[PDB]
Structures are given as C-alpha cells and as structure tokens.
Design an enzyme around this catalytic site. Sequence first.
Site, PDB file in Angstrom:
ATOM      1  N   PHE A  86       1.429  -8.591  -7.776  1.00  0.00           N
ATOM      2  CA  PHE A  86       2.672  -7.947  -7.386  1.00  0.00           C
ATOM      3  C   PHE A  86       3.887  -8.718  -7.878  1.00  0.00           C
ATOM      4  CE2 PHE A  86       6.148  -7.296  -4.274  1.00  0.00           C
ATOM      5  CZ  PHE A  86       6.351  -5.938  -4.488  1.00  0.00           C
ATOM      6  N   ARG A 136      13.223  -1.706 -18.560  1.00  0.00           N
ATOM      7  CA  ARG A 136      12.691  -0.990 -17.403  1.00  0.00           C
ATOM      8  C   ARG A 136      11.180  -1.170 -17.251  1.00  0.00           C
ATOM      9  NH1 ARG A 136      13.908   2.455 -21.230  1.00  0.00           N
ATOM     10  NH2 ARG A 136      12.232   3.625 -22.256  1.00  0.00           N
ATOM     11  N   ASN A 137      10.515  -1.655 -18.293  1.00  0.00           N
ATOM     12  CA  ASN A 137       9.078  -1.858 -18.209  1.00  0.00           C
ATOM     13  C   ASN A 137       8.705  -3.336 -18.227  1.00  0.00           C
ATOM     14  OD1 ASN A 137       8.118   0.952 -18.120  1.00  0.00           O
ATOM     15  ND2 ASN A 137       8.968   1.077 -20.190  1.00  0.00           N
ATOM     16  N   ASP A 150       1.470  -3.745 -18.653  1.00  0.00           N
ATOM     17  CA  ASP A 150       0.278  -3.558 -19.473  1.00  0.00           C
ATOM     18  C   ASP A 150      -0.029  -2.099 -19.658  1.00  0.00           C
ATOM     19  OD1 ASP A 150      -0.113  -5.645 -17.204  1.00  0.00           O
ATOM     20  OD2 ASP A 150      -0.973  -6.583 -19.000  1.00  0.00           O
TER      21      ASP A 150
HETATM   22  C1  P17 Z   1      12.758  -3.326  -6.790  1.00  0.00           C
HETATM   23  S1  P17 Z   1      11.210  -3.353  -5.811  1.00  0.00           S
HETATM   24  C2  P17 Z   1      10.035  -2.930  -7.076  1.00  0.00           C
HETATM   25  C3  P17 Z   1      10.173  -1.715  -7.819  1.00  0.00           C
HETATM   26  C4  P17 Z   1       9.234  -1.395  -8.822  1.00  0.00           C
HETATM   27  C5  P17 Z   1       8.154  -2.281  -9.090  1.00  0.00           C
HETATM   28  C6  P17 Z   1       7.999  -3.510  -8.349  1.00  0.00           C
HETATM   29  N1  P17 Z   1       6.975  -4.434  -8.554  1.00  0.00           N
HETATM   30  C7  P17 Z   1       5.833  -4.198  -9.291  1.00  0.00           C
HETATM   31  N2  P17 Z   1       4.863  -5.158  -9.389  1.00  0.00           N
HETATM   32  C8  P17 Z   1       3.722  -4.925 -10.114  1.00  0.00           C
HETATM   33  C9  P17 Z   1       3.544  -3.686 -10.765  1.00  0.00           C
HETATM   34  C10 P17 Z   1       2.300  -3.354 -11.571  1.00  0.00           C
HETATM   35  C11 P17 Z   1       2.221  -2.128 -12.163  1.00  0.00           C
HETATM   36  C12 P17 Z   1       0.956  -1.813 -12.949  1.00  0.00           C
HETATM   37  C13 P17 Z   1      -0.198  -1.223 -12.316  1.00  0.00           C
HETATM   38 CL1  P17 Z   1      -0.217  -0.851 -10.596  1.00  0.00          CL
HETATM   39  C14 P17 Z   1      -1.350  -0.927 -13.087  1.00  0.00           C
HETATM   40  C15 P17 Z   1      -1.376  -1.203 -14.478  1.00  0.00           C
HETATM   41  C16 P17 Z   1      -0.249  -1.787 -15.119  1.00  0.00           C
HETATM   42  C17 P17 Z   1       0.916  -2.107 -14.369  1.00  0.00           C
HETATM   43 CL2  P17 Z   1       2.242  -2.879 -15.230  1.00  0.00          CL
HETATM   44  C18 P17 Z   1       3.348  -1.150 -12.004  1.00  0.00           C
HETATM   45  O1  P17 Z   1       3.219  -0.063 -12.559  1.00  0.00           O
HETATM   46  N3  P17 Z   1       4.431  -1.469 -11.287  1.00  0.00           N
HETATM   47  C19 P17 Z   1       5.547  -0.519 -11.123  1.00  0.00           C
HETATM   48  C20 P17 Z   1       4.557  -2.701 -10.663  1.00  0.00           C
HETATM   49  N4  P17 Z   1       5.666  -3.000  -9.927  1.00  0.00           N
HETATM   50  C21 P17 Z   1       8.951  -3.819  -7.341  1.00  0.00           C
END
Ligand code: P17
Length: 271
Positions: A86, A136-137, A150
């Site tokens: 996270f 944004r990513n 990823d």
């Molecule tokens: C401002 S509060 C806030 C707002 C949006 C996001 C986050 N933190 C967060 N932390 C970790 C992730 C991880 C993933 C992810 C998953 Cl679930 C599977 C495969 C690849 C990815 Cl990169 C993801 O999609 N998101 C959006 C993630 N977001 C915090």
Amino acid sequence: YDKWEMERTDITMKHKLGGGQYGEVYEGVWKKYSLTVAVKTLKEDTMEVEEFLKEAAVMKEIKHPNLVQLLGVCTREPPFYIITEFMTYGNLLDYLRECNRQEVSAVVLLYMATQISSAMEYLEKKNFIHRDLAARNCLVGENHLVKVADFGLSRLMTGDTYTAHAGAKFPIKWTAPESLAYNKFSIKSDVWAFGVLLWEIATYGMSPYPGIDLSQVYELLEKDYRMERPEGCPEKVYELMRACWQWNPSDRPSFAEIHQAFETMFQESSI
Ligand SMILES: CSc1cccc(Nc2ncc3cc(-c4c(Cl)cccc4Cl)c(=O)n(C)c3n2)c1
C-alpha cells in the site's frame, strides 16, 4: 502450484481507492500480518479475466524498489484478487499539487525523477513497455518514495515495438508522435512520456500543454513545437526533457542514459 496464490479470507476489504480512476482497487488489511494493503478486484461480469490474469502474471516477474510490489493473488475462483503493497500518499500528481514546496523542494523533485528513471531502466532491460506512464500513475510513500504502477505493462515478445489494439484511446498529451500516428509503442515512446512526466514534476503538477486543445497537439509537435522550460527548472534538466521529445524515437536517449544523468544531477546537487 503457485507460491503467490493465497486465501481470500486473509484479506479484509475496506474502501475504494483513487475515486475509481484506477478501477476496482481498495484498501485492505492482511489479518495475518495486520498489514495494510492494496487490492485490485475483478467484477462479476467482464471479459477482463484474461487481461486481469496476465497483469497478475507479469507482476510475479517484476521486482524493483521503485515498482509497486505484488504481495499475492486470489485467481482460482471469483472474485479475483491482486494484492500489492500500500502506497500511503496516493499518486504523484496529487502529491505535487498539495505538497509544501519548502519540503518537496528542487532536490526532492530531482530525487523523485531519479527513482522513476530507475524503474524505467529496469523495465527497459526486462523488455517491457509501459502503456500509460504519467504522474497520475506514480504512487508516493513516506520520504518522497516513488513507485511506478505495474498495471499497464506489456512484454515485447519479438520486435522492440508493441502495437496496441487498433482503435485504442490513449492520453494525447503523454503520447509520443509515432504512437498517436501509428499506435506503436517502444521503450522510446515511454521516454517521450517520461519527458512529459518530468514536465509535470517541474511544474508541481500542472497539466501538459495547458490551454492547447487536443485536436492541435499532434500538428504542433510536427511543426516542432515543444512545451517551454518551466519557471525554476534547471537548464540541464530541461535539456534532457527536450531530448526525450526528439521527433525520431531513435534520437531519444535510453532510460539507462536518463537514469545515469539524474543519478549524477541528484548526487552533485546534494553537495
Ligand atoms: C490519496 S489516497 C490514495 C489514492 C489512490 C491510491 C492510493 N494508494 C495506492 N497504493 C497502492 C496501489 C496499488 C495498485 C495496484 C494494484 Cl491493486 C494491482 C496491480 C498494480 C497496481 Cl499499481 C493501484 O492500482 N492503486 C491505485 C494503488 N493505490 C492512495
């Protein structure tokens, strides 16, 4: 047997992340380790299972300090799960827009660009291309720690160029000329996007080509138009920004070079 496969019971879903802009992603808890995690979920009715599964698969192969880490998956029976670490501070775009600029300073911006270039260099060596490289990513954690998402990774099976499914829509302002023109993406296309990402970082989250309607962007780039050097942006960095925007993708630098350049600027800057 899959060392990654786990129990859907171990996880406790909470709420949705990023207001849905990333799909079915929620914040969760891994009971066992009282660890807070991110959970991507696939819905009931979707022709996504194929893609969802590949994303997970790809994620079991990549491991870099600046790429979000996979923790586990639940891909035997629905609902499907992809569990990752996270990132406590959300995406890099929001972070830059709200941050205290006395804290998130020039050296910090430099530091963040280095991390991202570091991940891209890894992907470059691994023969992957990212289909949506943008602030944004990019996710942020404590201490200005930045990791590239990823999701959106494709592996080059043969050529060095990946063709997207004819008739696909991509973010115009971040897309390289050749991609907009022929739907072809190479690591050099990512270099272009990275250059745009640099611009976002240097402007603390401004929209690229502000005020310029999308329908004009491709032509403007043909005619040799490029975004101007952001106020406060050191020349050395803008010069690299500009190299990323060479019209011919082979004229653009490699991520190895870009990383190298940043590692140096970052270092000699911290002196
Ligand atoms: C401002 S509060 C806030 C707002 C949006 C996001 C986050 N933190 C967060 N932390 C970790 C992730 C991880 C993933 C992810 C998953 Cl679930 C599977 C495969 C690849 C990815 Cl990169 C993801 O999609 N998101 C959006 C993630 N977001 C915090």
